[PDB]
Design a protein around this ligand. Structure first.
Ligand SMILES: [Cl-]
Length: 129
């Protein structure tokens, strides 16, 4: 599924991401835009052989199992394919564990380079929430 901007904002809000660990809704929408272009089916492979999955591009090296990343962990205890569903529940629940692990949203490279320190409120402007 390819979400619309306001559609994804409303979905994330319903799943408890607004101000989660102090990060306003606009931060999450901005990260999703630049990680996956709002596409739940996005995949990208990394140099070390791990793969990133879904709307928030969660890495198989640490967070999910894809059966082809040797010596990796599965800290969200899910198959990586569950992160590609049109229902974003699994992606959101895993993201909540990632953002709580001490480094906040700096875990997402696109957020650090393209969202951090910008006016992220603009990403939810005009949406009915
Ligand atoms: Cl933080």
């Amino acid at each position: 599924k390819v979400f619309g901007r306001c559609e994804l904002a409303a979905a994330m809000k319903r799943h408890g991401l607004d101000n989660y660990r102090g990060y306003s809704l606009g931060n999450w929408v901005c990260a999703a835009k630049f990680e996956s272009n709002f596409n739940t089916q996005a995949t990208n492979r990394n140099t070390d052989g791990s793969t990133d999955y879904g709307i928030l591009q969660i890495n198989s090296r640490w967070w999910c199992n894809d059966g082809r990343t040797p010596g990796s962990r599965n800290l969200c205890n899910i198959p990586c394919s569950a992160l590609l569903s049109s229902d974003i529940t699994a992606s959101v629940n895993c993201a909540k564990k990632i953002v709580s692990d001490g480094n906040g949203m700096n875990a997402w490279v696109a957020w650090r380079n393209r969202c951090k320190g910008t006016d992220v409120q603009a990403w939810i402007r005009g949406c009915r929430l």
